[PDB]
Ligand binder design. Structure first.
Ligand SMILES: *[C@@H]1O[C@H](CO)[C@@H](O[C@@H]2O[C@H](CO)[C@@H](O)[C@H](O)[C@H]2NC(C)=O)[C@H](O)[C@H]1NC(C)=O
Ligand SMILES: *[C@@H]1O[C@H](CO)[C@@H](O)[C@H](O)[C@H]1NC(C)=O
Ligand SMILES: *[C@@H]1O[C@H](CO)[C@@H](O)[C@H](O)[C@H]1NC(C)=O
Ligand SMILES: *[C@@H]1O[C@H](CO)[C@@H](O)[C@H](O)[C@H]1NC(C)=O
Lengths: 106, 335, 245, 120, 19, 79, 51
């Protein structure tokens, strides 16, 4: 199952709302996990199970979707979360990744 | 969830059923049993723990996963059983005595059942038979399956699924064999139409050298699921352990009530006792002498009767059911 | 109290069945493992089906692999029986010694040599006039019940009787067993491995138990377990010598 | 808590066996899934393989199955990576991963990681 | 005298009188 | 029609007689008969595990354990 | 036998000892996946036959 990350890039300021979509070529139900890549550091999990929050992660982060179409909504954007967005499925072996979505301060 | 070969179908036959019972344990003393089925309970489409719905195995060629709720599941041995708890492959229920156990889904008019032979015999604690526990009696140590969901009674070993072939991915037309795959999945083929052949194909594609439809095999390499080491499956070539899930409903030590019978009335005579006994249910009477030779005897007693027991200078010890042991000794009252 | 050492544990076996594998016009040979009662047999052509009615190419010279072994049940962590042997038993009295106005509570050894003391008093005990023990040479513990069953020794398993599943601990991986499982050539068109199995000798011994030694031992003598003693047991005369200050 | 630390040579010749080390501290090796993850610069993450602790079961990516072998050392609290006949496309940032769940594709834990450059 | 007690093959021959 | 097959018996050999170590979770029919002038037919439904002492003659004896193929045995002269 | 026409149901009962039977020399509850294939006689499930 291959991945087409959406959108590749998006510049936004502090407080805006950005939506990043996650489209799979096959129906993967709702088993999806998203990651936040910080440069010079290991990526941290934010959303597991395509709607559920990891402990420690901000509530402002809210993901949704089922089947093949998935979304993450980043409401009330801050300075610390300009990063690379990566949704990861865990059905087929081995697991695959996106091409990466870059967000930057406008 | 995988699908197994159930020994009794809906009508009379064996059939392949997705709620196939592997084995049933009855080691609990309160009549509760644990049932291993091939379907997963308490999980949704993704596998997230959602208590209201379960998932099972579908009756079609795409071999996907369908879901249903607990309002249409049933457990029965002779009458209906009361459901108590569930995780995944495992169920638990309280059942009347019977010669077999049945599991059944009622999916509208599509109603399917699985029946496996298991002599569910009713058991009891202590030394007295009882239908339901008294509100009054001795509190004795018992051993039950606990109602807590997050428990561990052991582990089972599951592995990767093997080849799951079909006929629906194959077709014979005008003396040649075709393979039709579904949309977006890659179905690998492996058969001998002469020389040995392997490959991976995602589109309608022909073969050569063979004219019969039965000679070839097509199966999808799906890694989305974990299958239990079942006697109804063709395994993968690499049958190694890859993960383990808990066995819930552990057999815990708890305290349970046991009845206390009628306290006997003892009449006294020369070097012997006689217990006037009444028992509506069969209870165990065990006696032993306090000398060099025990001369122990035991018999389960129903109804009312009287037993003549001789007592020596060393004495006699008797236990009437679940009461405290009482020891009796003889005098030298010669007439 | 005797000195006790365990040999093995015995409970209901779990007849785990591995899934068959097919190389179904290849050739397979019997392998050897270290599992409990590993029986493996190489059979002929069955042409097996599972759901599609075609699960095998090259339908002649159509061998398959059959595997069967046993392992502990998940409910054996409590419902199990452990075998013991005993030795020459030592007896222990608890004595209340009242001399004049001063009382004392003392537990001492019955051996004839070793003394017991309560702050002023030296009292020795033993030997017993008549040596006696209600324990036979081979005893079995089952949920606090001790039985005088002569179990077979370690490694000498008999199917259909007690001691046909033996392991040094409940979590031990060195489970040894000969429960006489025999494989049969499958005849049904669908895939399933047939096996015949003798009945559980643990369940046979449970059905043919008899009465406990708590209700069988003479001399007014109940039995306590973890570890195994016989309590309040009236026999013989004990010579006691008291060194009064 | 579980801590991971990568420790491998940073510059290896092509067509050579790459050996990389991740040590585990704070938890035992035999009760969790252990995972290697690569991350080429200018690209994204890609799966390598995984091992189970007390069983030694290995599942690897089909493309790299012929060149990835995973072994573990229970005495050193150790699991290792072997990559045979490396190429210039194998230059990547390497992560070792572990999870609070006994087995999950998502990894709760993650080493800082080590950079491996394949060049002449 | 034979060590085996029961064999799964019939006696091909019969014993004669006092022989 | 399908019918089950029970466990194969275990045979212990002694002088002019056999003893079958039998196991059956269900009551099954065991029928024996001799191969001589007198049949001496014995038949009993057996539940559980019970060992039966069967004296065999020189002419032989055929025992049928469940629905299996009848198996013929013959006694030797191991006096 | 009983019809249940809503709240007005009618039932008929006749006495007959329906005892469960088997074939072969072994007693069983439900037919095993494995065993000897033996001849028995069953009632035909197809309706368009005559006895
Ligand atoms: C089915 O097979 C095709 C061909 O191998 C796969 O398509 C390739 O996918 C990989 C990974 O995304 C790409 O790097 C290749 O460039 C693709 N090749 C072509 C020709 O498209 C496809 O992903 C496979 N699908 C499944 C379900 O495994
Ligand atoms: C018990 O003893 C009495 C007096 O000898 C006698 O009448 C009675 O029949 C005896 N009962 C039994 C149980 O033998
Ligand atoms: C227990 O023993 C009784 C009496 O021999 C027998 O009727 C019963 O079937 C046995 N139960 C089992 C299955 O052990
Ligand atoms: C069978 O014969 C042996 C040897 O004489 C004997 O020990 C055993 O008790 C006998 N069993 C029966 C069923 O009579």
């Amino acid at each position: 199952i291959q991945m087409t990350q959406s959108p590749s890039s998006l510049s936004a300021s502090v407080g805006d709302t950005v939506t990043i979509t996650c489209r799979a070529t096959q129906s993967i139900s709702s088993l999806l996990a998203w990651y936040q890549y910080k440069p010079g550091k290991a990526p941290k999990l934010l959303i597991y199970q395509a709607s559920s929050l990891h402990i420690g992660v901000p509530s402002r982060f809210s993901g949704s979707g089922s089947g093949t179409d998935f979304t993450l909504t980043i409401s009330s954007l801050q300075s610390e979360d300009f990063a690379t967005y990566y949704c990861q499925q865990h059905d087929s072996r081995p697991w695959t990744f996106g091409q990466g979505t870059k967000v930057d301060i406008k | 969830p995988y699908l197994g070969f159930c020994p009794y179908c809906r009508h009379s036959a064996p059939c392949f059923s997705p709620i196939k019972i592997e084995n049933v344990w009855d080691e609990s003393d309160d009549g509760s049993i644990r049932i291993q089925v091939s379907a997963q309970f308490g999980y949704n489409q993704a596998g997230t723990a959602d208590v209201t719905k379960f998932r099972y195995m579908s009756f079609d060629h795409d071999h996907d996963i369908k879901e249903d709720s607990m309002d249409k599941i049933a457990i029965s041995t002779s009458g209906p059983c009361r459901r108590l708890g569930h995780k995944g492959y495992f169920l638990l229920a309280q059942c009347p005595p019977g010669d077999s156990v049945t599991v059944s889904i009622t999916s509208g008019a599509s109603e399917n059942s699985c029946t496996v032979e298991k002599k569910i015999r009713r058991k009891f604690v202590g030394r007295e038979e009882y239908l339901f526990p008294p509100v009054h009696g001795k509190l004795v140590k018992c051993h039950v399956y606990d109602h807590l969901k997050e428990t561990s009674a052991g582990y089972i070993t599951m592995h990767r699924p093997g080849p799951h072939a079909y006929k629906s991915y194959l077709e014979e037309a005008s003396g040649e064999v075709y393979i039709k795959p579904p949309s977006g999945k890659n179905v690998t083929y492996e058969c001998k139409c002469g020389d040995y052949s392997t490959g991976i194909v995602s589109t309608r594609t022909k073969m050569n050298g063979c004219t019969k439809a039965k000679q070839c095999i097509a199966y999808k390499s799906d890694q989305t699921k974990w299958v239990f080491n079942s006697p109804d499956l063709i395994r993968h070539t690499d049958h190694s352990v890859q993960g383990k899930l808990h066995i819930p409903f552990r057999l815990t030590p708890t305290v349970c009530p046991v009845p206390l019978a009628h306290t006997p009335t003892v009449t006294k005579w020369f070097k012997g006792i006689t217990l006037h006994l009444t028992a509506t249910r069969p209870t165990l009477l065990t006696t032993r002498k306090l000398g060099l030779r025990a001369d122990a005897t035991a018999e389960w007693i129903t109804g009312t009767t009287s037993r003549n027991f001789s007592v020596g200078r060393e004495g006699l010890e008797y236990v009437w059911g679940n009461h405290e042991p009482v020891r009796v000794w003889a005098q030298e009252s010669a007439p | 109290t005797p000195s006790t050492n365990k040999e093995y544990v015995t409970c209901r076996f779990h007849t785990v069945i591995p899934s068959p594998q097919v190389k179904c016009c290849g050739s397979l040979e019997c392998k050897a493992s270290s599992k409990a009662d590993y029986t493996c047999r190489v059979f002929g052509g069955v042409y097996p089906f599972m759901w599609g009615g075609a699960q095998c190419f090259c339908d002649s010279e159509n061998t398959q692999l059959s595997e069967a072994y046993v392992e502990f049940a998940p409910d054996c962590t409590i419902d199990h029986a452990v075998a013991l042997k005993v030795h020459t038993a030592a007896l222990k009295v608890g004595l209340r010694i009242v001399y004049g106005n001063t009382t004392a509570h003392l537990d001492t050894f019955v051996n004839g040599v070793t003394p017991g003391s309560s702050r002023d008093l030296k009292v020795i005990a033993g030997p017993i006039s008549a040596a006696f023990s209600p324990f036979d040479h081979k005893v079995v513990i089952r949920k606090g019940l001790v039985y005088n069953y002569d179990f077979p020794e370690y490694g000498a398993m008999k199917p259909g009787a007690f001691g046909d599943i033996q392991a040094s601990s409940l979590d031990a991986t060195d489970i040894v067993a000969r429960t006489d499982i025999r494989l049969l050539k499958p005849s049904v068109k669908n895939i399933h491995v047939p096996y015949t199995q003798a009945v559980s000798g643990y369940e046979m011994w449970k059905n043919n138990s008899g009465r406990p030694l708590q209700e069988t031992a003479p001399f007014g003598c109940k039995i306590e377990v973890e570890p195994l003693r016989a309590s309040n047991c009236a026999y013989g005369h004990i010579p006691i010598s008291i060194d009064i200050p | 808590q579980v801590q991971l630390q990568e420790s491998g040579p940073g510059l290896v010749k092509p067509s050579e066996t790459l050996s990389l080390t991740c040590a585990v501290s704070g938890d035992s090796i035999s009760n969790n899934y252990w995972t290697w993850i690569r991350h080429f610069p200018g690209k994204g993450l890609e799966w390598i393989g995984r091992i189970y602790g007390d069983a030694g079961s290995t599942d690897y990516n089909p493309s790299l199955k012929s060149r990835v072998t995973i072994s573990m050392d229970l005495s050193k609290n150790q699991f290792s990576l072997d990559l045979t006949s490396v190429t210039v496309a194998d230059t990547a940032l390497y992560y070792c991963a572990s999870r609070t769940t006994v087995a999950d594709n998502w990894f709760d834990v993650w080493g800082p990681g080590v950079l491996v450059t394949v060049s002449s | 005298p034979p060590a085996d007690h029961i064999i799964g093959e019939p006696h091909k021959v019969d014993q004669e009188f006092q022989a």
